[PDB]
Symmetry: D2
Subunit: 233 residues, 4 copies
């Protein structure tokens, strides 16, 4: 009956919008935020309705803590949304290697390894409900232009994870992703001529997590990028 | 305010389910059906709520008639759903050429040319509302196995249409598709271990047509195929 | 021992270059040309070294005639290169339907149906040698920008053919394609900053037809487009 | 005039075959090998014809040393072939996190970060010749089945690198990849019904490095996998 979602990167941007949208859609929600300042925002907005955890998604025990607190408060987990991520600011391959190397470590630890980490930590509990995973990918999973080679590689790697994990975990667990692009969060033409606000981007996540609307969907990546995967207009 | 959708292939299968789902979601709906028998089914079910047209989607004037009757009854058109299609029954390339040739003509006239035809006929009116197109593609747009070379080629061609038309018609008109697979309609393992009923497949169409949920989506193809694009399990 | 290739679209452009390159590489070559004027060019250049056929690739018996004359002169067929094709001159979807319809018929009859036709006609003989097919696709098989929706759809359909036929005809017959773009033949930026001459584009065909270099390749599409599939620079 | 290639992973498998094939094709060749035992094999085979370096590709200075010794012996560098890589032995996402984490670090440091590292180290010198990069990707860059989620993700990330770097470094430097699959090196059906020996796989690298055959190719990935990207037969 009652559905439960856990969301990383939930202190801002799309993550924060997923918290609102999933709460409005009736879910019980847990959230991982980065710091105290983001924690205060959600406490004030949702009072004690949520289960909140502050920590670094690069730390496995923080991910296990998120799962553990979700189960203890709501009793089970139906969907894990791995969404925390970071940009590379168009870092050029001609830069000093040590600068590339340090950035690579951070991009790949947050945008890829941490997804493995949260999925590992969520897996036992999703197996008990035949739940699902949704990963935030990127237009840069499909097309060039919206990042440097480290960012694009990291997001291509997410696509790999989606296909590989969807295949290995079927039939019990669905694994899908969403590929947003050109939406302001904290320059973006896009063929549809505008940049999306984070709220304008959340519906694909709801579909992929929904047990009714999404029961037949796995391995799938839904672009919501104003046409940017097609090229400059 | 009031939204209006026009659906081909609406007498059966996914098309019929789109008629129900879009009516339940509040749309005014027009429908193209193939024959008298399908027309009687929808008259009995929806009484006079719909605008219905009987004819061959391979005939342009039938497509223009559908648009014309939609406008006259509801005043405008917000979304065209090109969905009529036919299968090739795994026709082998080793068969007599005249057999391949006759089948090719039919598959490509219905699965591709007719989509061009309906979009041409719907275009003036979608331009007046900044509406959208949703096309029914197929798992065979992405992967082999689910048809002969004629079917697969025809569905790859639909993908081409989606990308090409999404790019040309932006920013006013969004153009997207849905790629169902392994759902019974009138053998299908699929990694999720079951065949979907047509009702289980409709939510992606609603998202892509929705002006709120879908305003930032074009060029996109949403697989809903139980994982079949990933391969046999 | 002695290898034999048959090439359509061989009177000009890439086709003509394939005739030269494959002759220089030691193949016996048959060629389908469109008209008398192209026939005179190859007779003068190659004297009687080739087997030449004038006709419309849209006519099955012309394709069977090409195969039949190849076998009778050289005794067997090792590779069929389906290359004849036509452009759509960026025809807009907003044009009068009858104009779109007439153009669609021609683009799809030449760029798709004729490939089915030549493959059907070549198939018996390739099965006797475990030979191969190479199809000319296009950058427009992968990306928008280089044609109207009819051209792009037709070339996406070729990709479908490659995957579908490669899978059905394995293990005996390999089926591959080449996707050229931005090369002058009878405007093209391309990230590599120049337009290729037809001779600069032929090496991928030689690899895919070569029994030594290509024995492990099927289902494959080789872009040779100066980076154009990646987007405008 | 005289062409110079530098190859990592050159002590075995495809790398070793690339050393032979490129030497037979007239190139001057440098090679990075892992250990003393591989170094002895190439010294005995090629005597002092090559420039050889022993070290870990995960160490930047080893990569710079390879470049530096290439230039000092041959004077310039025309092509860098990043080929060193490692498999994940189908490691399951259900395994203990610390086991996944340790393996992830190694797969991604060798299969991705080291490619960034060698390209950074080769870049100054390729810019002086308008040279090229070829990366070894994998069937797992495109399809599931041939590895665990870490391997597949790492190889999807390589594809990202190819597209991203091809776009950023055009027009001076071409960047391409090769995606082998199902070839024994130190179980593999493949639709073509056999596993390739490493020698059977080298021709695509020669084409992508060749200044004549490959001058118009960048952003491209050439599968040579016996059809495995298409699915089980
Ligand atoms: N908005 C776009 O245009 C766009 C485009 C492509 C991809 N994305 C992806 O969407 C996802 C969410 O992006 P957003 O737009 O909401 O960006 P954002 O600027 O709001 O930041 C992402 C969120 O992840 C958090 N985060 C970063 N590092 C963390 C860490 N080590 N531990 C815990 N949390 C951490 C951040 O504090 C923040 O809450 C990302 O994966 C991003 O790569 C966004
Ligand atoms: N159900 C699946 O497994 C699956 C898989 C891949 C693709 N598809 C695609 O979904 C779309 C709808 O399929 P469905 O599953 O509901 O199949 P269906 O068996 O119900 O038949 C398709 C509909 O299109 C109609 N139609 C056929 N030819 C027509 C014509 N010339 N003029 C007017 N109408 C015509 C049919 O009468 C029917 O109503 C098709 O394009 C199909 O290619 C379905
Ligand atoms: N050159 C490029 O930039 C480019 C880009 C994308 C795709 N292509 C494709 O390459 C292939 C060959 O193209 P090209 O560049 O050499 O062009 P081209 O201008 O030389 O013409 C193609 C060849 O096919 C022949 N042909 C056309 N219709 C025919 C028919 N009905 N019957 C028999 N022959 C017919 C033509 O006479 C000509 O010889 C085509 O399929 C084309 O779609 C080329
Ligand atoms: N052969 C296949 O079926 C297949 C399939 C997919 C991908 N690949 C890829 O091809 C590339 C080469 O593979 P192979 O088939 O020749 O395999 P291989 O078993 O011969 O080993 C790869 C080579 O890279 C070397 N290497 C590993 N770690 C190294 C390190 N840290 N520092 C320096 N060298 C190191 C190894 O010593 C070896 O020489 C790899 O990237 C692999 O991922 C191969
Ligand atoms: O793709 C992206 C992912 C995450 C953050 C940003 C961003 C953050 C601050 C300012 C501008 C962009 C971004 O672009
Ligand atoms: O992909 C498909 C599209 C349309 C119809 C069928 C079908 C129709 C009757 C019986 C079985 C299948 C199908 O498979
Ligand atoms: O993609 C293409 C395929 C075939 C011909 C042309 C062409 C022919 C004449 C003049 C210009 C272009 C083309 O662009
Ligand atoms: O994809 C791959 C890449 C590199 C090595 C192997 C391998 C090595 C030893 C034994 C078996 C396989 C492999 O499969």
């Amino acid at each position: 009956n009652q559905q439960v979602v856990s969301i990383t990167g939930a202190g801002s941007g799309i993550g924060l919008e997923l918290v609102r949208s999933f709460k409005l859609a009736g879910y019980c929600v847990s959230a991982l935020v980065r710091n105290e300042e983001q924690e205060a925002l959600l406490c004030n907005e949702f009072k004690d309705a949520l289960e909140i955890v502050v920590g670094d998604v690069r730390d496995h025990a923080t991910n296990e803590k998120l799962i553990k607190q979700t189960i203890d408060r709501f009793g089970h987990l139906d969907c894990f949304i791995a969404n925390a991520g970071i940009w590379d600011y168009m870092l050029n391959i001609e830069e000093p290697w040590e600068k590339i190397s340090s950035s690579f470590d951070e991009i790949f630890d947050i945008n890829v390894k941490s997804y493995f980490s949260g999925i590992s930590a969520a897996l036992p509990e999703l197996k008990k409900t035949n739940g699902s995973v949704v990963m935030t990918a990127s237009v840069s999973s499909h097309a060039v232009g919206g990042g440097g080679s480290c960012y694009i590689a990291s997001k291509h790697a997410v696509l790999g994870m989606v296909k590989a994990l969807a295949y290995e975990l079927a039939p019990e667990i669905r694994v899908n992703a969403v590929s947003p692009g050109g939406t302001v969060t904290s320059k973006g033409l896009t063929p549809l001529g505008f940049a999306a606000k984070p709220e304008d981007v959340v519906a694909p996540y709801l579909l992929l997590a929904s047990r009714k609307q999404g029961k037949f969907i796995t391995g799938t990546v839904i672009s919501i990028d104003g046409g940017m995967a097609l090229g400059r207009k």
